[PDB]
From Swiss-Prot, chain B:
Role description: Produces nitric oxide (NO) which is a messenger molecule with diverse functions throughout the body. In the brain and peripheral nervous system, NO displays many properties of a neurotransmitter. Probably has nitrosylase activity and mediates cysteine S-nitrosylation of cytoplasmic target proteins such SRR.
Recorded name of the encoding gene: NOS1
Source organism per UniProt: Homo sapiens
Name by which UniProt lists this protein: Nitric oxide synthase 1
MF terms in GO: arginine binding; cadmium ion binding; calcium channel regulator activity; calcium-dependent protein binding; calmodulin binding; flavin adenine dinucleotide binding; FMN binding; heme binding
Description of its domains: The PDZ domain participates in protein-protein interaction, and is responsible for targeting nNos to synaptic membranes. Mediates interaction with VAC14.
Length: 414, 418
């Protein structure tokens, strides 16, 4: 079977055969579509792990034109011995790099995947303690940041064993700003991080209580209680936000960090689960300008910005929110570009994703993609992805969601 | 039970209405086709003249639903209606809806349109019964009355006009226009396009049918009307029935000189209305615009009027790189001008902020009274400023309820001319 997708702007039609390889569930049924559900849908047994390992080893050896080779067949037998004797197995370095790259290649919600094959993989599977995790993360940050010339990277900590010895980064990203609920109901800093800020304070973090405090790392090794570490400030690259035309913009006192580094997801490769695998790229401007700064539940600066623009805020039909939103996103891109910190605007990024998708259809037989996430949160239909039909399905290796660790961790101290 | 969450407010709604869905979405548990424009060809009865065991179950389903809707399931009138429909199919291979059943079915097809953000208005629909029509001249008369009623001097009113249902498939009524009012599009000798490029092919059919094109940028197309399967016929809508808004800007005096206008009445006329297994192939329906439809899609799509370059030029923006967001900046001003213009001339229009807020309220009402509301996030979220509208942050379930509006083939792909 084949499935066709069409671009209604260009009338290009692409043919998807890759979906036949898909694995788990989308959440949809034959009679209900759950395409807009954010999160739809203890550890594996010996019998569950065998076919998962085989499928991955088979696809790795197919990718390197050695399917059926002597090395293919011996690797399969070796993997089987490990599962039989130890109930799990260990990836070779080559397979770990391949697995990490393809989890990114398969991330249907990521618009930046044209870069998937240029990913720096830091093998941190020898780590045993939170102090070790801190060291590996500092090196990751320093390498990825590269003085503003940002480089994609992932650091992979020991895989899950019995489920009782998980490695976890408790932060949702390596670098985020704290949030503080005030007695009067207002919020200082990032409202999204109020709860995680509370957890850090309880663990002994002494907060400066400002609007852009870089949070400490909260690191869990081997299922032990997590521990606090301050990222050395010289490794946190930040950009003060100014506007090329409104000289008053800098008086907003806005800044942001340069490195987007997701640290709460789970990396699954051949049935193995890497519960701590922080990865980073570089920003698309709308992540900051639209979501971080203008979500009502976030820094929520639209009112303040429109006021300084003297816009008429009496009625919605004046589109004052729309006008202010554009200017804010102009300033974000101008600021990063001026400080020579890597950033991509939504027009350039969506254009590259369409080229990526077409190449993937030609060379791989498809490209799973989540339209709801791929279309930027402003100016949707003037980007080419809006007009692009997409098919969403789950391939493995994959990045997955997992519960927040504080909802499952059982504490040990006193 | 299935839950949807709003990530702005943390409201969670519980859906049980999906348990009444009838047609495939196109998705499976392994593949989601939520961004496919036409994902599924699952129809409720085969192409034309169904057998009795094919049509009667669909009719029984709808009459059952309608009589349930009015607290009369199993009543005398319900069981007589079942026997009546049973005899009509036995003797004519079809059946006829009562006027009340037609109105019920039309309102619920709108209520069930998962792609429509304007559905909070669904029960305020004026239904014009045109099932007595026999010729294209009569169709033109019915359509003129619809346009005049729905326009109402700028105070627009939602309406639908329903022509005779399909019988054997050779006697279809069709409006060949995709909307009652659209602008012509012309292929220029050099290679570009004048007017609306989306209507180049339809404009050619009209010209090839004897239409004398004024060959301008905003030439209201004629109506091409097909009655009882005969060849379609051209009619010019009296221009005094076609309300148009000239587009100007509340700040930019030069904006009026772009010479843009649009029409006030959006009237979809190429869709199919399906009620109880009956297929009404000509059912033009109209409401009032959301501003983004004109200012974002009609004006700023690359393959439509494509005016961003022009507007940005006049705005003196840096169009050297995409990162200056010169496209986004011009885009806002254009949509400001559209709202200001319609509102200045007292022609009904809604912005995307008010429309999306209304829809959230509609969703809440439907979950409260009906146990669900089918909605297509891909279509509901406006094509600009997505996440500063509340629908962007609203999870939605999509499923297909009947009665419904469906797509159908363009009639020039199927019509055997005489
Ligand atoms: C190199 C530049 C990159 C760009 C410009 C980019 C862009 C984006 C954007 C805009 C999102 C949406 C984020 C949100 O709205 O929360 C996203 C999501 C995502 N990205 Fe990328 N990305 C990049 C690199 C990477 C890398 C290196 C990886 C992993 C190795 C990755 C994996 C993902 C995943 C898994 C998601 C889904 C996140 C979720 O479900 O919450 N991306 N990306
Ligand atoms: C009264 C004000 C109304 C508003 C503001 C409104 C708004 C909209 C918008 C913005 C769309 C997307 C259109 C597009 O992108 O092409 C749409 C689609 C749709 N509307 Fe509504 N609408 C209204 C009335 C109605 C009425 C009266 C009906 C039927 C009786 C209806 C049925 C539909 C259907 C079936 C679609 C889907 C069209 C398709 O799939 O191509 N709407 N509406
Ligand atoms: C909740 N969604 C996860 C998330 C949150 C976030 F703030 C940023 C990113 C992200 C990640 C990468 C690798 C590049 C990029 N441009 N953005 C992802
Ligand atoms: C194939 N696209 C369907 C379409 C095209 C179009 F131009 C306009 C509308 C529409 C219809 C109604 C009743 C209200 C409204 N505001 N818009 C729908
Ligand atoms: C409800 C909806 O699924 C949710 O708000 C999604 C919409 N699309 C998104 N797209 C991106 N890139 N990031 C997001 O967080 C979301 N949120
Ligand atoms: C590919 C994609 O599904 C297609 O471009 C859709 C997206 N959402 C839309 N939404 C609306 N309201 N109208 C449209 O025409 C479209 N087009
Ligand atoms: Zn789906």
């Amino acid at each position: 079977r084949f499935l066709k997708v069409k671009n209604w702007e260009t009338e290009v039609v692409l043919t998807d055969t890759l979906h036949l390889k898909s694995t788990l569930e989308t959440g949809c049924t034959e009679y209900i579509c759950m395409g807009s559900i954010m999160h739809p849908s203890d550890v594996a047994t010996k019998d569950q792990l065998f076919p998962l390992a085989k499928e991955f080893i088979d696809q790795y050896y197919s990718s390197i034109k050695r399917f059926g080779s002597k090395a293919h067949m011996e690797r399969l037998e070796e993997v089987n011995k490990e599962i039989d004797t130890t109930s799990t197995y260990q990836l070779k370095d080559t397979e770990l790099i391949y697995g990490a790259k393809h989890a990114w290649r398969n991330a249907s919600r990521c618009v930046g995947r044209i870069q998937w094959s240029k990913l720096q993989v830091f093998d941190a599977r020898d780590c045993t303690t939170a102090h070790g995790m801190f060291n590996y993360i500092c090196n990751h940050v320093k390498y990825a940041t590269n003085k503003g010339n940002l480089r994609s990277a992932i650091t992979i900590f020991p895989q899950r064993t019995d489920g009782k010895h998980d490695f976890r980064v408790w932060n949702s990203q390596l670098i985020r700003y704290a949030g503080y609920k005030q007695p009067d109901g207002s919020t200082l800093g990032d409202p999204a991080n109020v709860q995680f800020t509370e957890i850090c304070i309880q663990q002994g973090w002494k907060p400066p209580r400002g609007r852009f405090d870089v949070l400490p790392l909260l690191l869990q090794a081997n299922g032990n209680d997590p521990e606090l570490f301050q990222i050395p400030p010289e490794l946190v690259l930040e950009v003060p936000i100014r506007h090329p035309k409104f000289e008053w913009f800098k008086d907003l006192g806005l800044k942001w960090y340069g490195l987007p580094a997701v640290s709460n997801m789970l990396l699954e490769i051949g049935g193995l689960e890497f519960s701590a695998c922080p990865f980073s790229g570089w920003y698309m401007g709308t992540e900051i300008g639209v979501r971080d700064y203008c979500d009502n539940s976030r820094y929520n600066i639209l009112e303040e910005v429109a006021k300084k623009m003297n816009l008429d805020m009496r009625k919605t039909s004046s589109l004052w929110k729309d006008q202010a939103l554009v200017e804010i996103n102009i300033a974000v891109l101008y600021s990063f570009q001026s400080d020579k910190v890597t950033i991509v605007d939504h027009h350039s990024a969506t254009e590259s994703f369409i080229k990526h998708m077409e190449n993937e259809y030609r060379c791989r037989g498809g490209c799973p993609a989540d339209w709801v996430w791929i279309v930027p949160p402003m100016s949707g239909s003037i980007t080419p992805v809006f007009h692009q039909e997409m098919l969403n399905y789950r391939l493995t290796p994959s990045f997955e969601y997992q519960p927040d660790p504080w909802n499952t961790h059982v504490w040990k101290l006193v």
